[PDB]
Amino acid sequence: SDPLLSVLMWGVNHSINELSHVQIPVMLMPDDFKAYSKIKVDNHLFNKENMPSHFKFKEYCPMVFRNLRERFGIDDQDFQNSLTRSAPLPNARFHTSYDKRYIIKTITSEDVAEMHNILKKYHQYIVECHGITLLPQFLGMYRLNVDGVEIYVIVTRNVFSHRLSVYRKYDLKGSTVAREASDKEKAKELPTLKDNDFINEGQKIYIDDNNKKVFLEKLKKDVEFLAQLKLMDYSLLVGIHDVERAEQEGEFDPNIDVYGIKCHENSPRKEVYFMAIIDILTHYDAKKKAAHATVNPEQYSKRFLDFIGHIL
Amino acid sequence: SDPLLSVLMWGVNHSINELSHVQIPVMLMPDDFKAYSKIKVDNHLFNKENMPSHFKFKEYCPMVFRNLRERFGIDDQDFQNSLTRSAPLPNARFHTSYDKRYIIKTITSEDVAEMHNILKKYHQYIVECHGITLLPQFLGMYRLNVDGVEIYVIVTRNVFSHRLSVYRKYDLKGSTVAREASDKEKAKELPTLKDNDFINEGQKIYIDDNNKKVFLEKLKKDVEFLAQLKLMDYSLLVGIHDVERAEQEGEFDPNIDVYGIKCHENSPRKEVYFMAIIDILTHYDAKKKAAHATVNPEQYSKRFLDFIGHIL
């Protein structure tokens, strides 16, 4: 239906098949972080029903992302299946793989330049923490061209569960500036609530002290890493699965729903939480470029950690 | 090893996979005879071991050749397997699929223009005779580019058997001009003998009168079709399999070795023959272009049929 979507699927299919033939070494070389693969297709009077007639597909740093997927426990055949067996669904734009495992977000060429800028340090951080992190798990990055339109996409692991539905959803920054959902927003089906909605509506997260301490330790290292790269304006995304409400119309695989945390036994309701850092690709400078048409990366870091520290 | 060979294999693999997704109708449209598919690949600092870094692959009239392969009883998955599972072997240049089913010949852009010129009438002739013909069975036509070198290839069904080895081999034109193998040639391992070697060495083909009559009827229609398109300078290729000599160091599947004809029961030796027309792409004009640096297409036709008429 959507031609840019068909190119992406075609492109991912192609990219994984190509890599299935490559010998994968344990390590990445400096060149791998500068590598890419380009395919340009021209069909004249042929294959009109499936694909656009003229398109380009570019994959950035294929070896680095192949390395990352494995580190994040993701098999290439499964990634391929999730993205190609049936179209991703819409809901900048984002799409979800038909099986709800992966998110595909459309980003700017500026975002792509920034991703390239941090990719090596991101990778080393992922190595250092053995892939145990609240940061986005970046799984692939592509450029799509279909006759006049060029778009860039990044693929991440879904923060939420692929099985367990989320009934309530928060986006927290811990900003001094008043963050609150709009009244038009508060009436969307699955709204995206913000910092005020949390402080105001006395939302509680019922997790035991061991899960709480582990979470905040992870969070601390992650946010310090982000501050260090002068990145800011990211959020904690928090989703809540109500086991009772799901039975009306609750265990999860922690190897697929990696961000899940069960509630403790004294929780007022049987709840599963999914919490992760999202939206990291705003460099201090790029935020100023969107503002033109007082708090820095270091401040943002502390503000963020205090707030999350308080709410759990 | 040979990069042009790797591109071809990669290209055929790609082409068949693409077509596996297309809905194949029973008929071809006029546009199908003008169609093509182009892929241009650029790998920067990636995948150096398997493939050249920069290459192009073009497939001419993919739907027509998909239609032809099925008409000639060839499944797309098998064609793909034969051409990609292991490299074709060398022996203008020609190559043989590792399983000996298909021949890959390198041809000029002039040959490609001529193939395009007759492709539609070739196809209609193949329809008319239900694929029962001594003409080459054209299965695919491609253009390969690897950094500075451009080559064109055509794929045909092997005249000879994929199982049964050929010990003697003739190329017959029935020309008034003296055709004979060279004395340097006559000492090659599996030499390519010609018209004189046949008349001179009293070669006999021991086939019964029913097989003989059927063969010559086919031959007659085929050569008339060729004369009609002003094509000439083609040969009858004749290969002989000696069942005895093959046991020293003999039935065949007529659905794979389609050009095979068993000897009759009174043959001095247990022999299988493989006979077919080859090398059809010389148009009257193109032969004159190679001669510059008396007999026409109609004459050639008669000369050819008389000679083959005499030798069986």
CA separation for the pair B1, B52 (Å, rounded): 11
CA separation for the pair A64, A126 (Å, rounded): 12
Give residues with Cβ within 8 angstroms of B266, minimum separation 6: B206
The residue among B172, B200, B192 whose CA lies nearest residue B309 is B172
Task: Give catalytic residues of B, as residue numbers.
Answer: 105, 233
CA separation for the pair B305, B224 (Å, rounded): 10
**How is residue B8 written in tokens?**
């071809």
Tell me how crowded residue A155 is: count the other CB atoms within 10 A of its CB.
24
Pick the residue of B45, B50, B67 with the most A CBs within 10 A to test the interface with A by mutation: B45
| Per CATH, domain A4-157 is 3.30.800.10 | yes
The torsion angle over the Cα atoms of residues B130, B121, B257 and B277, rounded to 10 degrees, is: 130
Angle between helices A3-20 and A76-84 (to 10 degrees): 160
SS3 A153: strand
Contact by Cβ (8 Å): B83, B75: no
Measure in Å the smallest separation between the Cα of A147 and chain B Cα atoms: 16
Residue type present at position B19: L
**How is residue A213 written in tokens?**
């301490």
- Across the interface, whether the CB atoms of B37 and A43 are under 8 A apart is answered yes
Contact by Cβ (8 Å): B37, B58: yes
Tell me how crowded residue A100 is: count the other CB atoms within 10 A of its CB.
19
SS3 B50: coil
Comparing alpha-carbon positions, the chain A residue that sits nearest to B49 is A22
Give residues with Cβ within 8 angstroms of A278, minimum separation 6: A136, A159, A171, A234, A235, A236, A237
- Contact residues on chain B for A32, CB-CB shorter than 8 A: 45-46
The torsion angle over the Cα atoms of residues B43, B49, B50 and B55, rounded to 10 degrees, is: 40
Give the burial string for A181-211 (b: 16+ CB within 10 Å, else e): beeeeeeeeebebbbebbeeeeeebbbeeeb
Residues in chain B: 312
- Across the interface, whether the CB atoms of A38 and B21 are under 8 A apart is answered no
CA geometry: angle A294, A295, A297, nearest 5 deg: 140
Q: What are phi and psi of B41, to 5 degrees?
A: -115, 135
CA separation for the pair B103, B124 (Å, rounded): 23
Chain A: residues touching B (Cβ < 8 Å): 18, 21-23, 31-32, 34-47, 49-50, 62-63
- Contact residues on chain B for A41, CB-CB shorter than 8 A: 37-40
- Across the interface, whether the CB atoms of A44 and B21 are under 8 A apart is answered no
- Contact residues on chain B for A23, CB-CB shorter than 8 A: 49
Measure in Å the smallest separation between the Cα of B37 and chain A Cα atoms: 4
CA geometry: angle B272, B274, B280, nearest 5 deg: 170
SS3 A31: helix
CA separation for the pair A19, B46 (Å, rounded): 10
| Nearest residue, CB atoms, A40 vs list B31, B40, B43 | B40
Q: In Å, what resolution does this model reach?
A: 2.2
Pick the residue of A45, A51, A57, A85 with the most B CBs within 10 A to test the interface with B by mutation: A45
The residue among A111, A85, A235, A117 whose CA lies nearest residue A171 is A235
Question: Could you write out the DSSP letters of every residue in A165-226?
Answer: --SEEEEE---SS-----TTGGGSSS--B-HHHHHHTT------HHHHHHHHHHHHHHHHHH
Dihedral class, residue A14 (left if φ above 0, else alpha if ψ from -120 to 50, else beta): alpha
Residue that the structure tokens 């042929």 belong to: A46
For residue A202, CA distances in Å to A290, B236, B253 come to 33, 91, 81
SS3 B148: coil
Residue that the structure tokens 């000679």 belong to: B307
CA geometry: angle A212, A276, A122, nearest 5 deg: 115
CA separation for the pair A114, A170 (Å, rounded): 26
CA separation for the pair B129, B164 (Å, rounded): 27
- Across the interface, whether the CB atoms of A34 and B44 are under 8 A apart is answered yes
Question: Could you write out the DSSP letters of every residue in chain B?
Answer: --HHHHHHHHHHHHHHHHHHTS---SS--GGGGG-EEEEEEEEESS-TTTS-SEEEEEEESHHHHHHHHHHTT--HHHHHHHHHSS--EE---EEE-TTSSEEEEEE-HHHHHHHHHHHHHHHHHHHHTTT--SS--EEEEEEEEETTEEEEEEEEE-SS-SSS--SEEEEE---SS-----TTGGGSSS--B-HHHHHHTT------HHHHHHHHHHHHHHHHHHHHTTB---EEEEEEEEHHHHHH-----TTTSTTEEEPPTT-SS-EEEEEEEE----BHHHHHHHH-----HHHHHHHHHHHHHHH-
The residue among B90, B70, B53 whose CA lies nearest residue B19 is B70
Give residues with Cβ within 8 angstroms of B286, minimum separation 6: B110, B114
CA separation for the pair B282, B94 (Å, rounded): 17
Residue that the structure tokens 């229609």 belong to: B221
The residue among A278, A184, A150, A298 whose CA lies nearest residue A230 is A298
CA separation for the pair B153, B96 (Å, rounded): 12
The torsion angle over the Cα atoms of residues A185, A186, A187 and A189, rounded to 10 degrees, is: 90
Task: Give catalytic residues of A, as residue numbers.
Answer: 105, 233
Question: How many CA atoms within 13 Å lie on the side-chain side of A161?
Answer: 22
**How is residue A38 written in tokens?**
């380009």
- Across the interface, whether the CB atoms of A34 and B43 are under 8 A apart is answered no
CA separation for the pair B59, B12 (Å, rounded): 9
Measure in Å the smallest separation between the Cα of B44 and chain A Cα atoms: 5
**How is residue B283 written in tokens?**
């148009």
The torsion angle over the Cα atoms of residues A204, A206, A209 and A212, rounded to 10 degrees, is: -70
Give residues with Cβ within 8 angstroms of B242, minimum separation 6: B167, B168, B269, B270, B271
Size of interface A-B (CB pairs under 8 A): 77
Which method, experimentally, gave rise to this model? X-ray
- Across the interface, whether the CB atoms of A32 and B45 are under 8 A apart is answered yes
- Contact residues on chain A for B21, CB-CB shorter than 8 A: 50
| Nearest residue, CB atoms, A41 vs list B35, B38, B50 | B38
SS3 B85: coil
CA separation for the pair B311, B278 (Å, rounded): 18
